[PDB]
Amino acid sequence: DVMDVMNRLILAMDLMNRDDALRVTGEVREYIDTVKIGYPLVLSEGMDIIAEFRKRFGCRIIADFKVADIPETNEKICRATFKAGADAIIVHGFPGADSVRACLNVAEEMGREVFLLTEMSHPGAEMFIQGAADEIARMGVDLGVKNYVGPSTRPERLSRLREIIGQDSFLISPGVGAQGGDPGETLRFADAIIVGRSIYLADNPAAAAAGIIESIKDLL
Amino acid sequence: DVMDVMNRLILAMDLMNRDDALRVTGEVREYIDTVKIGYPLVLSEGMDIIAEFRKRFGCRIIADFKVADIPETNEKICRATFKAGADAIIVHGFPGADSVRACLNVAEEMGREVFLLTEMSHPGAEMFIQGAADEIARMGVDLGVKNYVGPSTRPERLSRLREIIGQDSFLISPGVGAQGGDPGETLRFADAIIVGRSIYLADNPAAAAAGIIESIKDLL
Ligand SMILES: O=c1cc(O)n([C@@H]2O[C@H](COP(=O)(O)O)[C@@H](O)[C@H]2O)c(=O)[nH]1
Ligand SMILES: O=c1cc(O)n([C@@H]2O[C@H](COP(=O)(O)O)[C@@H](O)[C@H]2O)c(=O)[nH]1
Ligand SMILES: [Cl-]
Ligand SMILES: [Cl-]
Ligand SMILES: [Cl-]
Ligand SMILES: [Mg+2]
């Protein structure tokens, strides 16, 4: 009972121009039915971009908003985001359980899903997030979180996060390609990989996506 | 050399419809010249609301976006935010130094300021953020950050943050009113207080703002 991500591949659409974002997403549509839309695109083009993607493509939308406020503000952010048509939203765990619970409550009420971001993929994540991440994950499990995000760039950490959340939980993982993570190795632990620049900056994004999929063909 | 906030009072405009947000801000305009605009309003009404506030009120705009992504994405968020006319942006320190530096770089390029959020005001902040907060503040100092955010709801923690950053740094503080923080006590340590619901949900927002100011009149 998890979202059925085509080819285990989620596009991180972080182009900031509507025309370019629409073109590239359209070009890879035969390979990907799940698109992660974040603030680079939303702050450049408006929340109506979610509407436009739904209209143009047959794609699920994950709003990567890394929600990280107090409970009252988190509730408002989630409400606005789901109102706009996002299927799911990504929330930070480091602000604590009440902040996460606020998002879960709105998602339950509105019939949508929360993804909990545990450890991040960039070097700075080692300073504070890494040391909290196992506990953030355990907190997620205690709160009944079913969907998680963890880092492709640290296979040992991604493996531990998978252990904590169990095989039944859904885990997606960014940092593949540009940040150095390997698609096949990441899919040992994650249900789906998130890929941005490797696809959207390619001369031929469709060929780039098809190439990633070919490399993981035996894992589909 | 620091931001000059009228009446040491920053309005947290978290109403989610344009008409109400503009009306209430108009009602209190004689008391403030600095407005914090966050995702509740921006995700509901669009980034164009920032220019509209500048057109109507001439106020400074702090974009409270809790920026908490990897460096590459942080750059794009800051660029989109400053393009919309924000004077400053609030950035989480928890994701580490590289993520903060990404924001500082864009702010310098566009003539804007970064505010570093150290400890948060809500109960969940105790789980992970609080234990990292002094180190996050020292990181800010090392990075040359001059503007900080810390919690009205824990004056002893707010005082410690002031100690770390020094008297020359600029410190603003939310959690006043609704979350239990006291305006005058908070201004012992913060340069300015952030106030949302105690004003914008009041029967008479102007009288609410006037009342807060009366209570701190000997601190102005
Ligand atoms: O830990 C994380 C969490 C993320 O959401 N992301 C997001 O995943 C995407 C990665 O894109 P890319 O493949 O271009 O590196 C970006 O949208 C980024 O904001 C990440 O890189 N690391
Ligand atoms: O630690 C923090 C950091 C914040 O930015 N905030 C923000 O400050 C505002 C507080 O508003 P209020 O006065 O209604 O509690 C909200 O916009 C909230 O998102 C906070 O409450 N605590
Ligand atoms: Cl709250
Ligand atoms: Cl770093
Ligand atoms: Cl909590
Ligand atoms: Mg007083």
Side-chain angles (χ1 to χ4, degrees), chain A residues 12 14 36 64 66 90 117 119-122 149 151 174-176 178-179 194-198 200, chain B residues 69-70 73:
Chain A
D14 298 311
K36 187 175 76 62
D64 182 6
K66 289 183 186 61
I90 303 176
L117 174 58
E119 185 169 329
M120 291 179 72
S121 63
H122 65 295
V149 185
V176 173
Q179 295 178 57
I194 292 161
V195 180
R197 288 164 284 171
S198 286
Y200 73 67
Chain B
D69 220 299
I70 69 170
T73 296

Side-chain angles (χ1 to χ4, degrees), chain A residues 66 68-69 76 92 95 98 122 124, chain B residues 66 68-69 92 95 122 124 200:
Chain A
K66 289 183 186 61
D69 219 302
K76 295 182 179 183
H92 262 297
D98 55 355
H122 65 295
Chain B
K66 301 291 192 310
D69 220 299
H92 264 293
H122 65 296
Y200 73 69

Side-chain angles (χ1 to χ4, degrees), chain B:
Chain B
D1 210 332
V2 299
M3 187 176 300
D4 193 323
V5 175
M6 182 181 294
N7 291 320
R8 302 178 72 178
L9 175 63
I10 297 169
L11 174 69
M13 179 38 65
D14 297 313
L15 291 171
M16 297 172 75
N17 82 90
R18 182 180 164 273
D19 287 346
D20 293 331
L22 291 172
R23 186 192 71 254
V24 171
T25 305
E27 281 169 8
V28 304
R29 65 186 297 172
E30 77 191 87
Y31 301 109
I32 63 166
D33 64 2
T34 307
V35 178
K36 184 177 78 62
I37 291 181
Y39 284 137
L41 181 52
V42 157
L43 300 183
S44 299
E45 295 289 355
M47 288 288 275
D48 281 354
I49 196 71
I50 292 168
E52 184 162 24
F53 271 61
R54 288 181 62 156
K55 190 170 181 182
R56 283 176 182 241
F57 312 117
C59 54
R60 291 184 202 88
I61 299 293
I62 299 170
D64 182 7
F65 290 176
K66 301 291 192 310
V67 183
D69 220 299
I70 69 170
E72 287 83 355
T73 296
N74 276 13
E75 176 180 347
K76 292 178 166 178
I77 293 172
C78 290
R79 202 167 297 276
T81 296
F82 299 141
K83 280 182 163 47
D87 297 289
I89 196 167
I90 297 172
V91 180
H92 264 293
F94 208 85
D98 56 355
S99 286
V100 178
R101 177 56 67 183
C103 300
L104 291 171
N105 292 336
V106 178
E108 181 184 338
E109 182 185 346
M110 303 186 66
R112 316 295 160 93
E113 299 291 336
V114 165
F115 278 74
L116 184 66
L117 173 59
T118 63
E119 184 170 333
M120 289 181 72
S121 66
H122 65 296
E126 290 184 352
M127 291 188 69
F128 308 111
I129 291 173
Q130 181 174 84
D134 283 15
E135 187 174 355
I136 290 170
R138 290 191 310 272
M139 175 188 74
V141 176
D142 287 338
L143 289 176
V145 174
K146 293 183 177 175
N147 303 286
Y148 297 82
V149 186
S152 174
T153 50
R154 304 187 192 95
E156 85 285 19
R157 295 295 304 136
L158 189 65
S159 178
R160 180 63 185 139
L161 169 59
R162 168 60 72 187
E163 286 177 345
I164 294 166
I165 67 183
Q167 297 294 340
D168 288 345
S169 296
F170 193 70
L171 174 58
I172 67 179
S173 184
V176 175
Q179 298 177 54
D182 180 81
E185 287 297 290
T186 303
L187 291 174
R188 290 171 64 189
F189 312 114
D191 296 280
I193 47 172
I194 293 165
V195 179
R197 284 165 288 171
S198 287
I199 294 172
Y200 73 69
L201 292 186
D203 289 329
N204 185 341
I212 293 165
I213 293 163
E214 171 68 19
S215 78
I216 59 174
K217 65 182 183 181
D218 293 331
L219 308 179
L220 303 181

Side-chain angles (χ1 to χ4, degrees), chain A residues 166-196:
Chain A
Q167 302 302 323
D168 291 338
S169 297
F170 191 66
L171 176 59
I172 67 175
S173 183
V176 173
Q179 295 178 57
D182 181 80
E185 288 303 299
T186 304
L187 290 175
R188 288 167 65 188
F189 312 112
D191 292 279
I193 50 174
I194 292 161
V195 180

Side-chain angles (χ1 to χ4, degrees), chain A residues 5-21:
Chain A
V5 175
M6 181 178 291
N7 290 317
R8 302 181 71 185
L9 178 63
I10 299 171
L11 176 65
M13 178 36 61
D14 298 311
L15 292 173
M16 299 169 75
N17 169 278
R18 188 185 299 257
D19 290 333
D20 294 332

